[PDB]
Design a protein around this ligand. Structure first.
Ligand code: MG
Ligand code: MG
Ligand code: MG
Ligand code: MG
Ligand code: MG
Ligand code: MG
Ligand code: MG
Ligand code: MG
Ligand code: MG
Ligand code: MG
Ligand code: MG
Ligand code: MG
Ligand code: MG
Ligand code: MG
Ligand code: MG
Ligand code: MG
Ligand code: MG
Ligand code: MG
Ligand code: MG
Ligand code: MG
Ligand code: MG
Ligand code: MG
Ligand code: MG
Ligand code: MG
Ligand code: MG
Ligand code: MG
Ligand code: MG
Ligand code: MG
Ligand code: MG
Ligand code: MG
Ligand code: MG
Ligand code: MG
Ligand code: MG
Ligand code: MG
Ligand code: MG
Ligand code: MG
Ligand code: MG
Ligand code: MG
Ligand code: MG
Ligand code: MG
Ligand code: MG
Ligand code: MG
Ligand code: MG
Ligand code: MG
Ligand code: MG
Ligand code: MG
Ligand code: MG
Ligand code: MG
Ligand code: MG
Ligand code: MG
Ligand code: MG
Ligand code: MG
Ligand code: MG
Ligand code: MG
Ligand code: MG
Ligand code: MG
Lengths: 129, 151, 144
RNA sequence: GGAUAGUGGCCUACCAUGGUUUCAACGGGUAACGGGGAAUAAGGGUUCGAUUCCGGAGAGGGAGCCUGAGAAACGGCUACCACAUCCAAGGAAGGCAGCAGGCGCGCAAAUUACCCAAUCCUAAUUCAGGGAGGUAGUGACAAUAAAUAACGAUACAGGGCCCAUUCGGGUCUUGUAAUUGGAAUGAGUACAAUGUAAAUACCUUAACGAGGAACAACUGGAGGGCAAGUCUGGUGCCAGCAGCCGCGGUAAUUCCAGCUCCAGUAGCGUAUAUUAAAGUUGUUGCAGUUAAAAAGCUCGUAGUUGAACUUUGGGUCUGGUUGUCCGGUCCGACUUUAUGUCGCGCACUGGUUUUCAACCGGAUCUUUCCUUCUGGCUAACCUGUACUCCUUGUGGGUGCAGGCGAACCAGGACUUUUACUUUGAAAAAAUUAGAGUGUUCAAAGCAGGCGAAAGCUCGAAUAUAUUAGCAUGGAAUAAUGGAAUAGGACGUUUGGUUCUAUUUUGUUGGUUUCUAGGACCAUCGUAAUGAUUAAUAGGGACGGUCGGGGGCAUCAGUAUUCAAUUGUCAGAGGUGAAAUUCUUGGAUUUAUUGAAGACUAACUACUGCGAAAGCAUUUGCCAAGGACGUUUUCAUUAAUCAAGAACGAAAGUUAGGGGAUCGAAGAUGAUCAGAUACCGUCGUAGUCUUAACCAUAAACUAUGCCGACUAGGGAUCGGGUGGUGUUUUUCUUAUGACCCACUCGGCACCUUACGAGAAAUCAAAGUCUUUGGGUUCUGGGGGGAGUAUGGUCGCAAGGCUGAAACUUAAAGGAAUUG
RNA sequence: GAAUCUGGUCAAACUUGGUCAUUUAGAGGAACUAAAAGUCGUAACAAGGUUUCCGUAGGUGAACCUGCGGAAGGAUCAUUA
RNA sequence: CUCUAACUAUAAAAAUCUCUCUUCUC
């Protein structure tokens, strides 16, 4: 049973990147996947994706440009207080100069730097760098 | 590809066409289709056989495309929906058949295990239909009382 | 993914799983069962006095051929009897029979050390005076 | 009802039979007082917290009580129990877990000292009292700073050297020598004075106080881990050393010493406990094919987890914060000064619509609502009434009835409910963090600083606590709820109902009004009147199938062993070789047959079915099942699963049936040194069954299940699609059987690493330090040991659950060379 | 208004058995370790000289042997010869 | 660029073994 759909999407992205491809076909295509890929676009780790209406949860075709090296979900969307954001960034991101802990706040799904700018924090979705 | 109660992994199914609206070539009327559905139900047919008949002998791709309502929903609007939902009824029919086969020959252990599987499935479906209040909250499946519902 | 559950509401089984697995260790099992108080010659005690019953020497293992000079001591705190080791070269004669001797641990967590079999305790003091002070002739046995 | 100060099964009387529990109740253990906190420290945590503060409890264990506001008090009484004291034997008096001190205990812990100076407290109250407390005594528990020498002048030396005639001055310095000099200083004593309630002690300081400055620094170690010796002597697998590996058997770098050296140093060594190391507890963050470890398999309650979908956009205005360009302001190069100058490209403060670019907001328009009214209060001008102060100018107003309410009140009204997260109030001080501050530095402390010396002063900062509660902004993520019988939402609808009661007719009692205020009830209309998809999730219907899936009943086959008839005639079995055994009552073979029971050869394969065991002659019946096809149906019904359950090879156990073969035990004949083992001949139980037990296997793919993705190559099984395909023959065609292509599902297989592993190897054992899809079970060195005990199941066999004491430095995995 | 005294009430504690828990001896029995220069065999590691191992049952100085099912951790990944 | 044929056939017996292990630095 597909429990965490975003996990499947990011796993497909990782597999299709490690093999060097430039495209992925993510099947279930929820809101959260769309927002995750939109954040990745805003920061450039992804290219030009596409939603394919099925009337059936839709699908997504993702274009890459090799700039990304790893996605990944934190499957238990831990409640992250504004104090623990730095802890997650240290534990997940490889360096302080880049990388982004994509986390879901009451103000939408945002990268950790943007959430720290709004001075709001919520649950953690995943990480990209 | 789950096959809840076995090791199967098949995905044999049907792909509903993208267009929800009526097919261009269909000339029948929605009111006539609903009348046909009502007549078939009055003949004593479950919704699945009604859909099969409308797909084979007539141009009805599916009721929801043509009318806008589902077959069981259409029957319920006219008050012909059976007191026991069709899939659960067929499960009880199968269970009573296997129990008959068992009580007519004891040593068959494989059919005993299959009866256990069927009863587990019956319990699951009954729990679902009970949490949606289709069945009364006192409704339960019992081995002795299943025959009366089947018969 | 892994054997352990990962859901946000699975704290209970994670905690009880860790609590059931902790018994696999030896230190935790000893600490919680409290076997030190009930079974060991000393109950959580670094040192203990005792009375010398007799004056024995015990042979070593295969790779080491010698006879290590031990002493059988009955503990005064509870009455148990244990063999103990007189450490240095000419200290066997220093400790006489039926004198109070303060045994200590042997440094290997209550297990036999080196090539000496069936011993787990040193000898630090005899008749109130320490063996190291006697061995370098800094003090002398009171002989009471 | 009693009692209580008061609520309260707190107690009584009568009723009801209830309350907690797999979210662990109840019971057992705690060498458990709870907490503030301590150690430890990347982060997460682990252990400790008897004790300087806050609570609680206790005064030998128990009960009972007077006095008071407050006690179930114990430096208050009564009694029992335990332990005791004086005794003139009649009696009397006891409570150190207060300060001292003693006995005992144990490895383990202080002087019967001074005093109310300081903090305070009690009292009639300054004055009295206070073993509270402070001061000293002991005190290497811990903690801070820090002496044990420093500098010359000489002899023995070494490096930068002027070059290099050998030199060599030592030209330039740095060490080594029992040589040799002059200084400085305490650690100690001690006039004093300060200190203190009085005294020590410290701070200061007379007078003494260093030459081997004997005023003498130890504790461990010198094979490795781990800095430092293969120097000397001694002992020779002794004595002993060694945390582990190891040294010691006549040349010991390891034992005992001497010499030298190393580490820390007034401290160092040991013991136990504990923390980091321990990614060896793994939530972050462990492993399960073989190293320990996937329940034999399946179902299943609780638990955990659970598909997608319900406003996304835009345009404007506008507020802070940035970097912008420069304004004023000005400062660095020019030095006793600056500007003119060289610009750091402005050290303070603005235009910041200079386009810029954000980084946050706020209001506005969407069929785009933010709870709305009901009176306040109308705050405010869409009010227009009297009108215009002033340049004829909507810049600007004195202002009264409508009328803007988020600019705000205070009231009825409805509030889907959470989880989550931001901010704030709260989380006692001490402690941790941390600001200021020359305690001589520091541990500390909360002090101090500055005047001219003539009173003037800044302090005693902050943060964190991650749980529970309260308020608050947000509405993604996660969950629940609406309207399906409409009993749904709205309205000036139009009707009826119990009422309720302000005022009003004085007040009081009712009768109706009227007005206004909730609904119960019909009817009338307004409305876009109201049901998300149908997961390459699941269940179910249907279709033709497919299968050595299962049950019952039948059918056959040769074979085996016996038996009948017949045939001849010395051997036949068996073996490495023999023997035991059967045979002229004619065995072994030879032909027909007959009986019994078992079983299903060859077909039989890197083939099929099943949940796993397992399943292989034919036919019928019984029901079941996977896979495929499906523009069929329901719409989350699902995944994994403690508790519970169904099957579970062989062997084994009760009975009844059979009884061929083969064969545990047994009987023998051989082989041997022995052979009650392997070879051989007989041979009970068993093997075969109908009921009832058993629940274990190397129950193995030693690989849990569900889900997604990642790489090339062929084949094979079941299904389905297409071929202008080929033989088929029933003239043509329809099938069937092949051939080609594709697809779904299954047991599988070859190549490869570009991934993973300790590798053997794996297309999963991959997508794991770039560590998180859901979930169950198991392992923490080996042995003891899957043993004992206690449960529980079983008739029994035995199954499930399942340690410790103790012992050990390895056991073990894969591979390489021999 | 004292002694005394009626009924309760809180109830310590005593006697008597019962029960459980912890210590506590205890004839005797079955073990397990370490110590390896005793004795009888030589099971296993090679085809361990009967391949090995597992479950179960029987037997026997002893390791072990045998029977029935498995398994390769086998000594075969292989018969379209 | 066309292709499925040849072949057999050995198992007698064999138990056990007292030392001792030694440094790599240019
Ligand atoms: Mg505590
Ligand atoms: Mg206690
Ligand atoms: Mg405490
Ligand atoms: Mg205590
Ligand atoms: Mg206290
Ligand atoms: Mg008290
Ligand atoms: Mg006492
Ligand atoms: Mg008073
Ligand atoms: Mg008392
Ligand atoms: Mg007292
Ligand atoms: Mg008191
Ligand atoms: Mg008194
Ligand atoms: Mg005392
Ligand atoms: Mg005191
Ligand atoms: Mg002490
Ligand atoms: Mg002293
Ligand atoms: Mg000295
Ligand atoms: Mg020394
Ligand atoms: Mg030494
Ligand atoms: Mg030495
Ligand atoms: Mg070294
Ligand atoms: Mg020597
Ligand atoms: Mg491990
Ligand atoms: Mg093994
Ligand atoms: Mg293993
Ligand atoms: Mg398994
Ligand atoms: Mg459940
Ligand atoms: Mg979801
Ligand atoms: Mg505090
Ligand atoms: Mg501090
Ligand atoms: Mg009215
Ligand atoms: Mg579907
Ligand atoms: Mg076919
Ligand atoms: Mg026979
Ligand atoms: Mg004959
Ligand atoms: Mg056959
Ligand atoms: Mg087949
Ligand atoms: Mg279970
Ligand atoms: Mg049997
Ligand atoms: Mg029988
Ligand atoms: Mg025999
Ligand atoms: Mg014999
Ligand atoms: Mg035999
Ligand atoms: Mg026989
Ligand atoms: Mg087992
Ligand atoms: Mg297993
Ligand atoms: Mg172990
Ligand atoms: Mg074991
Ligand atoms: Mg038992
Ligand atoms: Mg090996
Ligand atoms: Mg009385
Ligand atoms: Mg022998
Ligand atoms: Mg052998
Ligand atoms: Mg063998
Ligand atoms: Mg042999
Ligand atoms: Mg043999």
């Amino acid at each position: 049973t597909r429990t965490s759909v975003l996990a499947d999407a990011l796993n497909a992205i990782n597999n299709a990147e490690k093999t060097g491809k430039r495209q992925v076909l993510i099947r279930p295509s929820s809101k959260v996947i769309i927002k995750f890929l939109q954040v990745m676009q805003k920061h450039g780790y992804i290219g030009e994706f596409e939603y394919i209406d099925d009337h059936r949860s839709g699908k997504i075709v993702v274009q890459l440009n090799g700039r990304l090296n790893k996605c990944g979900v934190i499957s238990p969307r831990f409640n992250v207080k504004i104090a623990d954001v730095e802890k997650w960034t240290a534990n997940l991101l490889p360096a302080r100069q880049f990388g982004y802990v994509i986390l879901t706040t009451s103000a939408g799904i945002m990268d950790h730097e943007e959430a720290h700018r709004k001075h709001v924090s919520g649950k953690i979705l995943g990480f990209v760098y | 590809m789950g096959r809840m109660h076995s090791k199967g992994k098949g995905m044999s199914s049907s792909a509903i066409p993208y267009s929800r609206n009526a097919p261009a070539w269909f000339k029948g009327s929605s009111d006539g289709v609903v009348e046909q559905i009502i007549k078939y139900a009055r003949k004593g047919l479950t919704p699945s056989q009604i859909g099969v008949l409308l797909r084979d002998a007539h141009g009805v791709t599916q009721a929801k495309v043509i009318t806008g309502n589902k077959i069981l929903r259409i029957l319920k609007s006219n008050g012909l929906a059976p007191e026991i939902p069709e899939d659960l009824y067929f499960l009880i029919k199968k269970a009573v058949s296997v129990r008959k086969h068992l009580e007519r020959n004891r040593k068959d252990k494989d059919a005993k295990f299959r009866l256990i599987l069927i009863e587990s499935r019956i319990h699951r479906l009954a729990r679902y239909y009970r949490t949606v209040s289709v069945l009364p909250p006192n409704w339960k499946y019992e081995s002795a009382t299943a025959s009366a519902l089947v018969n | 993914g892994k054997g352990k559950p990962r859901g946000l509401n699975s704290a209970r089984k994670l905690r009880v799983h860790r609590r059931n697995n902790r018994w696999a260790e030896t230190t935790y099992k000893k600490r919680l069962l409290g076997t030190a108080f009930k079974s060991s010659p000393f109950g959580g005690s670094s040192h203990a006095k005792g009375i010398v019953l007799e004056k024995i020497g015990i042979e070593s293992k295969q790779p080491n051929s010698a006879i290590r000079k031990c002493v059988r001591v009955q503990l005064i705190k509870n009455g148990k009897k244990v063999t103990a080791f007189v450490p240095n070269d000419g200290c066997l004669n220093f400790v006489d029979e039926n004198d109070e001797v303060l045994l200590a641990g042997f440094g290997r967590k209550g297990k036999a050390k080196g090539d000496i079999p069936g011993v787990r305790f040193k000898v630090v003091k005899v008749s109130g005076v320490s063996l190291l002070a006697l061995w370098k002739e800094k003090k002398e046995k009171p002989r009471s």
